[PDB]
Design a protein around this ligand. Structure first.
Ligand SMILES: *[C@@H]1O[C@H](CO[C@@H]2O[C@@H](C)[C@@H](O)[C@@H](O)[C@@H]2O)[C@@H](O)[C@H](O)[C@H]1NC(C)=O
Ligand SMILES: *[C@@H]1O[C@H](CO[C@@H]2O[C@@H](C)[C@@H](O)[C@@H](O)[C@@H]2O)[C@@H](O)[C@H](O)[C@H]1NC(C)=O
Ligand SMILES: *[C@@H]1O[C@H](CO[C@@H]2O[C@@H](C)[C@@H](O)[C@@H](O)[C@@H]2O)[C@@H](O)[C@H](O)[C@H]1NC(C)=O
Ligand SMILES: *[C@@H]1O[C@H](CO[C@@H]2O[C@@H](C)[C@@H](O)[C@@H](O)[C@@H]2O)[C@@H](O)[C@H](O)[C@H]1NC(C)=O
Ligand SMILES: CC(=O)N[C@H]1[C@H]([C@H](O)[C@H](O)CO)OC(C(=O)O)=C[C@@H]1NC(=N)N
Ligand SMILES: CC(=O)N[C@H]1[C@H]([C@H](O)[C@H](O)CO)OC(C(=O)O)=C[C@@H]1NC(=N)N
Ligand SMILES: CC(=O)N[C@H]1[C@H]([C@H](O)[C@H](O)CO)OC(C(=O)O)=C[C@@H]1NC(=N)N
Ligand SMILES: CC(=O)N[C@H]1[C@H]([C@H](O)[C@H](O)CO)OC(C(=O)O)=C[C@@H]1NC(=N)N
Ligand SMILES: [Ca+2]
Ligand SMILES: [Ca+2]
Ligand SMILES: [Ca+2]
Ligand SMILES: [Ca+2]
Lengths: 388, 388, 388, 388
């Protein structure tokens, strides 16, 4: 039986710690993969942590980062949520330097994108084998979520980008059923930029909160229906959630336009909560450091700056990275609704830190019906390592 | 089908060795987690060893114990009983520096407590995901068993503490059904102190034998019914079972009062045997060393000092630690009754020993119908290690 | 239920990357077996990577290659496709310095050949145990595919050789049902030489494209029917696919005769595509380096040199090795046809490279309905290693 | 459903190599347990290799053999046949310095014996938990097979010894059903000595071929019926199969008496083959080196020295050790009969070799319907190791 995921997303008051894998700590001595872009996604039986290795291990000569962010050795693998991304526990998924995965109730789907910059190949797997391919249509680093995709009535949905890092690119959503792409849509968004979407199911549609890497310190929101009609705009809330971003007191929300006058960004998430929203961001507006989650009243519908909750997960003295959304299935929680959860990546090493390598660890939070007190579940690795 | 666990506890004449994981020995070269508080608990299919890592490994720089007894890196994981708590065999359970786990016949429940001292969060998991949360209610190191909890008719029971280490604190029991707390009770015990309970099912109720960390060299007994009425007092037997404790010939039992004029303690267990009892304690009254089990006649009901059996499991030249209770399910043993078993932790390293780290190994004994001869299944690691 | 595999092979326009295990890279620090001859084969549930260890690990003193290409320590093991051939993930199959494996829909069959050169023993396993034996019939290095065998209606088929490396030998096919050899045929091929066949099912027969190690720069084709009648000849296409081979513009195809005036070779594959063919070969005509796949029009039936597609998988600056064929089952793909896939081995170390050891890694491609752009998924290990 | 194992043992013409785990080779760099006494036994699904660790690893300081042959750290564990006895693949069975295991069709039974020399405890496990205990009855190193026990109609049978190494001891057989000892028999054998039996099912009875450690260079045979009546005597064949033993031309068989004038021995096996026998022995009469198997005509019933087959498995330049018997179940082979198989242990290290440690590897042979050529599948580890 295929997962419905047509339930409303639960309205959540705080987030409880789910897991912490301590990858880098363990990887000081154990045999753990160098990774980046480690997202969480769930089947009806288990939550798995997916990650992109660089085909090398921590504390090995091959972790040296003379290589490309995309390389031939990179692969998408997985472990049960909470395990480190270690060699001996790892499930191979796809060849990939960008990916998305998600379970339809019967099987894992997975899409790893690899090949050259000018002509990337994304390969859909299903049941553990290649079932379909989507080639670069715009010739410039075909790419996708680096977080969970989203399946609704046994059909699966994901967002990809192809084009410039730093100016107008091109954006499609895809629709798959059992590893066969049965539909796509070209997403009109001129002046806006979309990458790395964080998507989750809500009341029968896919909702995404993505990264604008061109002009905007606010994140695009893309809401896609089963049949592929969509709405695109920006996160309405009167707070900024990208980094780098400006001050809060320097910032006016927009439902329709990137605001703030900066490039770059980072991947992140957020959850529609009726008309409200929970929105993650780094505590530093200049760096990938600290992580907070902010609940804003009416922030999904209006340029509100009514904050009603804030909850810190990583302190501003400690590294963070990417963050992304996912939901717990009803077959696991037995609820009326879909439980929202996020992961945070905690990037360690060069250039920030004086090592030859760069990796990432993670912690996973989930929505609960009781507020939850601040703390920091940071990465905690003592750098530099022996190989350095 | 949910486990009944309404059977009487079997009356046992001695204990047979079940397992020995040799964690520290193996961890001299293999990749094994630094741990403490490793308890045993069983499902209808298997017995698992749960433990709290410190997010580091043996013989790695991160085992250095500049960290807190509670830290952000600590997690609850598990392995099949008898496996070392090694990276590659480990099942992630919860983020935790204190925990309890137990199986209801369908799934594992688990509760890991983490967060700051002033405002801890305990998160109930069920089927491998967060299902509920109980925040610190008294603001001072929310905490629980570090041994198996107890499920009876698909409902699960555990004891937590919140408050001072060394004076009056506050004590609640909780009742869960499929990871949802459906009931709690505030345990009146003025002048007495309760932590780290060792609990097991017996004739339809939970029985616990706990740690008093304030005034008492005798252990509290808490017996809790399905509907959460309870009895609380002290282990009646005319022997002391905490450490530090006084002499035996200096000691008068009490059913109602801590006796002996000392603080601190250690976690331990014991089994009601009709009106008799089996009671573990360290052989040293001053240190966490050696381990014995003593059967006392009428010791559960009267301040008896009629010892009828004694069985040594670790010699007084060798380190011990915590001990705790659990039962074998009827689906595994095919008996009329619930088989009592205990584990013992064998704590190695600083401050006792000259190393940077501190860990724990374990051995597991179970009740059998034949007396069993003394011996020592001590930890056996040659210290100090290379990292030292 | 036994697999049919009576479907036609799908007509494929390009090949998508399936996996990359990065064995040697990972094996720089992780505990990975030294191997050679790593082929892929699939069951109705999963694709597995099989390989022949040399009973030693990477970066260990025992990888020193004073040993024989065939030795007593060599064994056939397996891992899920994409895992490195690491100790802790490895499934033991057979004792072997040559092997073939394949799934009949119920169980894995496997045949490992071991023993002395003059009197080898090949042992058929089935369900994970020895079920039958075929001894050397010609006294000179009994041997077989080093790739997947082929089961059709619950019956399994494989090709072996016994005789000289470099002159006329002797060639049998075998037919097994549930690990019991129920039929064999002596393959008349005077002047031709056959080793290491790459075989796959197509329209109810086994098709193979093999290695001639005596006179021929073209590969033999052997097509075997259920009842063991066969056709044998050479790959008709007007391109050469062995190495070492001559120039393309120096080369005339033959359906019936080895052409090109050289010894040695390498194992490789190819796919009948109606009357066309896909044919792998190394890009270097002198060395085991680079890997391409070429589609030739009418190349299965005529000495065509009409190339219609070419796709590079490993660049001519990088090592390759063996290649072999396999198909995805219908129980996995849900197609009308059998999906063709190949693996490539990427041999590293001595004598080519200045190390004491020699190993192999792999990448796996599969047939898809969209052309696919060139790139190189080479092995990427920085040599020499520490043990060197 | 419980296994019958009431079929006659198959009449076998040679033995084919089944597995080779290369434990010591792999253990030079990988994390593998120091072990001794590694036997094979099978369930309806799989063959497992059981072994007794010394709670330490290869190439670790703890492999130093200042310890006892029996120690507190020793444990019985298992791996799938062919895997090395490595930490990360190992299944914990029992605490043990002597053991026996065997599957009844539903579950594994296992008996590990531990505790002091003067008062050993043997603990029966079943389904992965302690179910029963047999204490030392004669006060002198209670002990058992170190090979597979034997279950017939869901009932299980094993032989133990208690008493002197080197003079008259005492010998019982036990009968278990689902981990509960339901019967035992005291085995009258005055002047004879019995240890370490190698037992297998045949035509509804247990047959064993054991070790006499007192006076006899011939092995005792014990045949035990379901209801525990038994026959005991010696291997009739006119060849000797213990080591140390005398010359063959110096030796007269006996059905009833130890012959040859020596102490010590080694564990080994043999198979009734109608009236004939296959009998293993070391090739050296003075040392644990080389291994052969000999088929003797009428050798089970008469003091025959008609040898009809011989097959070498390990050469006389290479170390051997213990050997033992087991059968493949009908649920795996689909035969009319029970397939005989043996394992051989290949003991490496001190005192023989200049190291601090001592371990064992293994190879497994099985009976097949075709003669099989000589060779040597010896252990192949280059000694001494780094820790030495
Ligand atoms: C890390 O790698 C550094 C740069 O290496 C050089 O450039 C790369 C692209 C390769 O071509 C490499 O083979 C070249 O040597 C080295 O300078 C440095 O030694 C490395 N450090 C360590 C610790 O391995
Ligand atoms: C163990 O750690 C000792 C104390 O470290 C110092 O204090 C802690 C809290 C950290 O701030 C650490 O970074 C500081 O240096 C060290 O003195 C000692 O070097 C360590 N020993 C080993 C073997 O790693
Ligand atoms: C690799 O092995 C080389 C050759 O070893 C010699 O010949 C082989 C067949 C054995 O008999 C071996 O024991 C002999 O010493 C050695 O010369 C060399 O030391 C080895 N290198 C390493 C790094 O182990
Ligand atoms: C191996 O062990 C040798 C003997 O050790 C001594 O006696 C044993 C029973 C223990 O008491 C031990 O602690 C004593 O030192 C040592 O002489 C030797 O150093 C050891 N060798 C290695 C390589 O560890
Ligand atoms: C395909 C690709 O390389 N994606 C990048 C991503 C990218 O640079 C920007 O979004 C520009 O398009 O940035 C980052 C990043 O840390 O910012 C990591 C991702 N790395 C990987 N997914 N491997
Ligand atoms: C929550 C907490 O830190 N619990 C402690 C416990 C505690 O110090 C006393 O019981 C005072 O309340 O003591 C000990 C101890 O060894 O005595 C270990 C436990 N460590 C862990 N559970 N991590
Ligand atoms: C049985 C055997 O040793 N087969 C060889 C094979 C062989 O040398 C030629 O085909 C001549 O018959 O060559 C090669 C090779 O790389 O060319 C590897 C194979 N190695 C292994 N299969 N182990
Ligand atoms: C219980 C015990 O220690 N059994 C011994 C066994 C024993 O010395 C003789 O049979 C005398 O009774 O000998 C040997 C041996 O190699 O000869 C190994 C066994 N070691 C272990 N099973 N651990
Ligand atoms: Ca931006
Ligand atoms: Ca106390
Ligand atoms: Ca050739
Ligand atoms: Ca003898």
């Amino acid at each position: 039986q295929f997962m419905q995921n047509t339930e409303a997303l639960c309205d959540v008051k705080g987030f409880a710690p789910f897991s912490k894998d301590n990858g880098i700590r363990i990887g000081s001595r154990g045999h753990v993969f160098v990774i980046r872009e480690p997202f969480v996604s769930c089947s009806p039986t288990e939550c798995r942590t997916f990650f992109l290795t660089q085909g090398s291990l921590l504390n090995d000569k091959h972790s040296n980062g003379t290589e490309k962010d995309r390389s031939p050795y990179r692969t998408l693998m997985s472990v049960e949520i909470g395990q480190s991304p270690n060699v001996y526990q790892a499930r191979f998924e796809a060849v990939a330097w960008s990916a998305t995965a998600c379970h339809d109730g019967k099987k894992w789907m997975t899409i790893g994108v690899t090949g050259p910059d000018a002509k990337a190949v994304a390969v859909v797997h299903y049941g553990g084998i290649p079932t379909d391919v989507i080639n670069s249509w715009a010739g410039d680093i075909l790419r996708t979520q680096e977080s969970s995709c989203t399946c609704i009535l046994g059909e699966c949905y994901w967002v990809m980008t192809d084009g410039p890092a730093n100016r107008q690119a091109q954006y499609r959503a895809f629709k798959a059923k059992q590893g066969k792409i049965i539909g796509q849509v070209e997403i009109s968004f001129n002046g806006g930029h979309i990458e790395e979407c964080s998507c989750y199911p809500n009341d029968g549609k896919v909702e995404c909160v993505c990264r604008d890497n061109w002009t905007g310190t606010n994140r695009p929101v893309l809401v896609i229906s089963p049949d592929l009609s969509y709405r695109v705009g920006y996160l309405c809330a009167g707070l900024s959630s990208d980094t780098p971003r400006g001050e809060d007191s320097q910032f006016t929300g927009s439902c329709t336009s990137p605001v703030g006058n900066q490039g770059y960004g980072v991947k992140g998430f957020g959850f529609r909560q009726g008309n409200d929203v929970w929105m993650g961001r780094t505590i530093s507006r200049t760096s990938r450091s600290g992580f907070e989650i902010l609940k804003v009243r009416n922030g999904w519908v209006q340029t509100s700056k009514e904050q009603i909750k804030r909850q810190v997960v990583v302190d501003n003295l400690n590294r963070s990275g990417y963050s992304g959304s996912f939901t717990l299935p009803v077959e696991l929680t037995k609820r009326d609704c879909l439980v929202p959860c996020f992961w945070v990546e905690m990037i360690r090493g060069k250039p920030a830190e004086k090592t030859i390598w760069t990796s990432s660890s993670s912690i996973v939070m989930c929505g609960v019906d009781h507020e939850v007190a601040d703390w920091s579940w940071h990465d905690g690795a003592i750098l530099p390592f022996d190989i350095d």
